[model samples]
Target chain A: SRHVVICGWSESTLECLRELRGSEVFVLAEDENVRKKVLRSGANFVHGDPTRVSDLEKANVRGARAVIVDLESDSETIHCILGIRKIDESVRIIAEAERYENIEQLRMAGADQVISPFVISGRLMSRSIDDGYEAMFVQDVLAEESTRRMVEVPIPEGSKLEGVSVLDADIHDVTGVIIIGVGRGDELIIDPPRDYSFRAGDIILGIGKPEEIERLKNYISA
Target chain B: SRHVVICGWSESTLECLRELRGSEVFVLAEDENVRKKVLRSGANFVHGDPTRVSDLEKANVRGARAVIVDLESDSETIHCILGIRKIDESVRIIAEAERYENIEQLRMAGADQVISPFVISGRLMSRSIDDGYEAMFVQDVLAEESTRRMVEVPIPEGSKLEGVSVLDADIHDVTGVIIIGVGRGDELIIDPPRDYSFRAGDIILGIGKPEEIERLKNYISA
Candidate 1:
């Protein structure tokens, strides 16, 4: 039977098995203590060296659609990947790399996806920071029917919206958006009172459709 | 002027600040080299001990909407949070915790959001791994005018939808969803032929509203 093969025994493997929804996962690990822990968790395990050809076969590597290889220590990068790739040329391999230089090495080793949380976090944080976190949040959180998205719209100087109160403007009735939060002068207010008035320098965190946000933005400009 | 105050100097802090949008950020670091690095990043800096109340005040903590503190060591948890809270009691303080024991200390420090990225990563990875990494992609990637979300819904045994083909189903016309991918055993097929029928074990990679997803789910159950 086809199944997902996890080629390691660690917290990641333990956590992954817990979250598996649609398919069976068999773990490949050589450590006795780790194998015992896996079985204790009610998971199937193949006790074998992940780096050896015969060991991989014992784990049914050919029958797997995917394999997740651990590169935390990566002593056997060239050896391990070469072995696995040779056995199943078409199977998707996902590997974790810790260093920048190691990334290329992992990819060359036939990994379909090489994810390093450390690097990914840094790269994503940069993009988020560049976009004020809200724009990115709107783009990053993808689920729904409503065009309702959270965004930081800067109210321009000398704009009509600047002097208008929330009650008077009725942004929701007019443009289908809710001004859920406002950030001003280092003070962030969530759900400001309806009586609160807008100021030129204040940044409004609003939620609505793209067209709605566009209309609001156009109204705030000039 | 409005600003976000960063309480330490590390890659996480560095990455966070660099990605910040709409608000100016001031870095509070005691290390001479790091203060220079912060300045080099085109951000304002307050050279001082982050664990000191006097230094925090110099950074204008009272004027910030939020403060991000690094617990890289978490050794000075009590002193650091006490120092920050003594300055700005209301500002949202986001702190990172590592050990199981350190999380409580962070919450007690008046941190509104104490993120254990390590823990978050593991849990999230489990969910992603469970669904073969695509379902969570729809929820986390964030922006959409298209009311459809990509998700994985398993084909139940003995369901009407199980043996249905893309052509006979009229799923797109009826539910506004497209079957972009399917996960069956170890094989993940993307953009399968329309006539390709669903197997009981096949997990459909679909795009549609939650209601539409529900409609499709209910369509098959009976």
Candidate 2:
């Protein structure tokens, strides 16, 4: 059976455990309170410092399929990643960094995945700007190609494409691109109907070759 | 001035380049189309193979603040990261890997950041199901110390909290929790007003100590 090794038991770890239902999860924490909390979540819990390799080994890090390092401090998180890597190279290590500056160092320490809370918070603030009218989440917008381009374009009033059916807009004919979705009135329409009309207050989600998208953007704005 | 060195010219590189506006960017690409696109994007384009030491040297890799390895092949990306590490140990290196198996190797080769696109997509798909609503696409939620938790409870017809103001519900007395938002009928309400009324099918976004949130979720559901 695939097992998950999570370092630190915080609010974040609790949320992760909730999502990881039906999976064998092992949690490591130095705090007695946190250990109790982890145990209550129905996951195997160990009370030990994650920065120490011995503690990770005791928690059976070698057999785990994925290791999540969610320690409180950046130094400890990086140290945990390093310790895990030294013990087992095959285990997938996911870690959290308090600062963006530490992301690279954490990654270099063998963290297969790293997330910066600061960056995500900043992005959340930016997304809140046009919350009701624009959808500005990041995802794979382009297919595998040499010219990868993802853009966030605000829909302007009276544009040539506005009030036009998506299929009749000839976007592919003119730009060789596809409309991924439309951010309409607080909702994101992914894979929208071909006949969906481009509205005035909608944000267009498009992806294609760089030059083509750029050209289309300029033409639409013009 | 901060500078970013792009080791390959692909669509993802272009996307990153566009996002890094007003920053000094160097794009190294041997392909004519990619080179042309980089040039048009107003970045300094260098025609070279980033995996080769000589090519990276010619691209002036020494002075760069950060280097991104996004070659077409995982082998090429790993090679470029290693070569760049050898030339400049201080420069931050971000590399892309197509497979989970290559993530550790990329880190060992001195990739400060190794991004696996497929893993992220897979997680996103799973998150949507874990949370009844379509969750926000924050990269690697498993790696974050903070996560969005969704609690679902049907609004009983004669419940006391029903039709009451969300603020007066006195949810904070139970714990130091802030209502981040509320999802009702395909709409997400962030920082909802004090007078916001609870209705059926309303999924609340509450941030607090994990145990408190869990208790509140149970209290409401019961």
Individual DockQ of the candidates?
A: 0.08, 0.02
TM-score for chain B in model 1: 0.57
- TM-score between model 1 and native: 0.47
**How many pairs of residues collide in each model?**
11, 2
Q: A82 in model 1: Cα distance from truth in Å?
A: 5.2
In model 2, the runs with Cα more than 4 Å from the true position are A132-222, B1-222
TM-score of the A-chain for all models: 0.55, 0.60
Error of 2 at A182 (Å): 19
> lDDT tens string, model 2, B1-222?
667778886545655665566777888877866666677877998888788899899888998877777788888888888899889897877666665578789978886555554444333332322121122324422222444322233455555566778757756445434444566653555445567899755666544445666667665653
Give the best candidate by TM-score: 1
For candidate 2, write residues A1-222 as lDDT tens digits: 678788886544665676577988888898877656677778987888898989989999998777777887889888888899999997877676666578789878897666554344333222222121111123222112224444446667777777878657766456644444466653554444546887775666555566767777776772
